[PDB]
Design a binder for this molecule. Structure first.
Ligand SMILES: *Cc1c(COP(=O)(O)O)cnc(C)c1O
Ligand SMILES: *Cc1c(COP(=O)(O)O)cnc(C)c1O
Lengths: 404, 404
């Protein structure tokens, strides 16, 4: 017969690497805001695959774009041109108002590309001596799992046992304008990379005026402002980009995850000519980067966000989510925070009561969430969710939290 | 109306990064060994997207596996389980006879993972002091475009202007057993990563007995043998793995590209428990890594290679390709080399006659190939090609080469 949920866990334990400890649930089907496990049980998805399925699971428009293009052409590599890439590039650049886009597949690849961009620009344009270029990062950052990505992490889980590490990466505190200003005194600094809201750090929202201060400081000291919007971008926080909230324009913008609706690994690096064209032909690429199949689903994934006004929906419904969560007792829930539908709660963890245990009972009551820490639960459902669906989910959260 | 080929070039020039200089051809459709441009012209594909489409463009079995799964579930992330991953993991591990597999998306990600694996094992098992671990690479290597990947490159195009670089990466000559044996005297060396045939270096085939000498040297000095079979793997060279030719078993095997049939970015890192389980939960991952959609197409892509005996076909037909190419005049074609259907010719380049010009006239006569250097043309068509189709393609090569 068909495998049970425990059979699925057992099999992955035996034949799969041990690099995750997931919440025990075995999903076989997903549609919109809902997921179904192998036993048939229905759940509210309050993770959205880390904001990869902002448009909901298997959004018909994006599915059709995939199914259409697979019968035509899926991969020529970039050694030749394909008919689709140029259409996507024009679309996404005019959408976010940058000269050009460099297509990659995963989020970390977009970040790796941004580092190479910043460095190359730093040497060939800013005039930094080779190879003295620095890139500043904020403590609590997360932009992937490559050797370079974990070299700028302050999380021991990411970097411990994986050294030696990438030089030229400096770390300052997040949400700290004086600390940035101090760091940018060094003229060898080529760029500052930062998340408008830190996701994995636990939905850490910086004070109002931070993003504007960052922009101001960067421009002043001729330093590139890299905005990592792989998680916070694409309507998740209530706007096209989280930096739109302070009308800020970064030099480089990184997109990923929701850029495909969870149907294909597609990421993007947006910036203007004087930055982008520092990389000459043959000096960068990726086999699957810019393939026609990924492009069709990306166009469709972006069209869904615009057509269905999901940025507006995320903003209105987020307010309701946060206002209802703040009604929970202070001695149980310490804090509520976020923008739009990227939210998180902090719980008063004890030795015998933690975020994992809360998420297990959440699962039991029909809602899937992941703890990002022993005392932090993140709540981020797809942006297609309706208000009645949200309030039902809120009642499941209230029931579960108070049941302890 | 629909864009012309020149329109497609123009558009990408304006709105796309300048990180490639492709052969001027605008493909909109592909099926098996053939590609069609926007003007309707038919071409023999003698690149196979860098061996990503070993099974031919849009192979119906793989297309069906994709179309089927997209209606079900495409991405939960690894925060939860999905029903498909465990099935794929069991399949691929039993196929290549390793305990476990760690799933990633792109080829460079598989390599990045192998470095982290080798380092972690080196510290936690071998006993190397943190962080003194080294990884040896062969000159002329290519395993992607991350900061770490270009740090071990000997190609100035890859690394120039992108420093400072990753420490703990040492470089020795390819196809050099004494040079390896010298390098492994240092007990801080955790691993040696190498391609059984160097692809991007120009299909550089090492002398017989090299892979066996590498295995012997590694075992002796307690060093991990990493085999990068992202390009040479999966029937391309005539066997499941290029190392099968010398009955060698690496400690870590890297797969990619053809693992999906060009329908999805899927890569793999195969190794046993004592290496794999050095990475504990939460110490590594990727958002899209191991997603159910990529898994279904990967299973189907592997089933095609086996069912249609494409390794056998690549071996027989490759011989014919090389034997026919060697008939070309010595003063025009310097050398012919390769294994199976991964082949390349070296031409007697002059100032006014080069590999690019040869490929342009190739394109004109209905065959698509890319030069890997001013004097090297690579010939690698999909493994589904038939003998009559091959010989037709050979006549186009003879016609073009001799026409100068
Ligand atoms: C998830 C994430 C990434 C990395 O995405 P991957 O596809 O897993 O490599 C990078 N930056 C941010 C802000 C992210 O949330
Ligand atoms: C092409 C290639 C890679 C890179 O794969 P990507 O998916 O483009 O990152 C790595 N190793 C070898 C041997 C390759 O041929």
């Amino acid at each position: 017969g068909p495998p049970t949920s425990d059979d699925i866990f057992e099999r992955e334990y035996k034949y799969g690497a041990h690099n995750y400890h997931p919440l025990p649930v075995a999903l076989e089907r997903g549609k919109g805001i809902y997921l179904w496990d192998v036993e048939g049980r229905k759940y509210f998805d309050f993770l959205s695959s880390i904001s990869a399925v902002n448009q909901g699971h298997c959004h018909p428009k994006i599915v059709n774009a995939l199914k259409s293009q697979v019968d035509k052409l899926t991969l020529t590599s970039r050694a030749f041109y394909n008919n689709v890439l140029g259409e996507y590039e024009e679309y996404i650049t005019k959408l976010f108002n940058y000269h050009k886009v460099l297509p990659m597949n995963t989020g970390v690849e977009a970040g790796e590309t941004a580092c190479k961009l910043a460095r190359k620009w730093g040497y060939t344009v800013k005039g930094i001596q080779k190879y003295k270029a620095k890139i500043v990062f904020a403590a609590g950052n997360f932009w992937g799992r490559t050797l370079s990505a974990i070299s700028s992490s302050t999380d021991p889980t990411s970097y411990d046992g994986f050294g030696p590490f990438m030089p030229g990466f400096d770390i300052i505190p997040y949400n700290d304008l004086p600390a940035l200003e101090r760091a940018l005194q060094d003229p060898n600094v080529a760029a500052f990379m930062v998340e408008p809201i830190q996701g994995e750090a636990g939905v850490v929202v910086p004070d109002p005026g931070y993003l504007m201060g960052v922009r101001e400081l960067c421009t002043r000291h001729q330093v590139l402002f890299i905005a990592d919007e792989i998680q916070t971008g694409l309507a998740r926080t209530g706007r096209w980009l989280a930096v739109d909230y302070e009308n800020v324009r970064p030099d480089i913008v990184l997109l990923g995850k929701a850029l495909s609706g969870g149907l294909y690994p597609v990421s993007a690096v947006l910036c203007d000519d004087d930055i982008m064209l520092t990389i000459k032909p043959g000096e960068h690429g990726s086999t699957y980067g810019g393939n026609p199949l990924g492009c069709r689903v990306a166009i469709a994934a972006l069209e869904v966000l615009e057509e269905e006004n999901l940025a507006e929906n995320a903003d209105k419904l987020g307010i309701i989510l946060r206002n209802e969560l703040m009604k929970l007792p202070s001695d149980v829930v310490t804090a509520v925070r976020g923008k739009g539908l990227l939210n998180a709660i902090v719980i008063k963890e004890t030795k015998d009561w933690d975020a994992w245990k809360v998420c297990l009972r959440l699962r039991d009551n029909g809602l899937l969430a992941k703890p990002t820490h022993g005392d932090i639960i993140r709540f981020a459902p797809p942006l297609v969710i309706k208000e009645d669906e949200l309030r039902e989910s809120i009642e499941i959260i209230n029931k579960t939290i108070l049941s302890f």
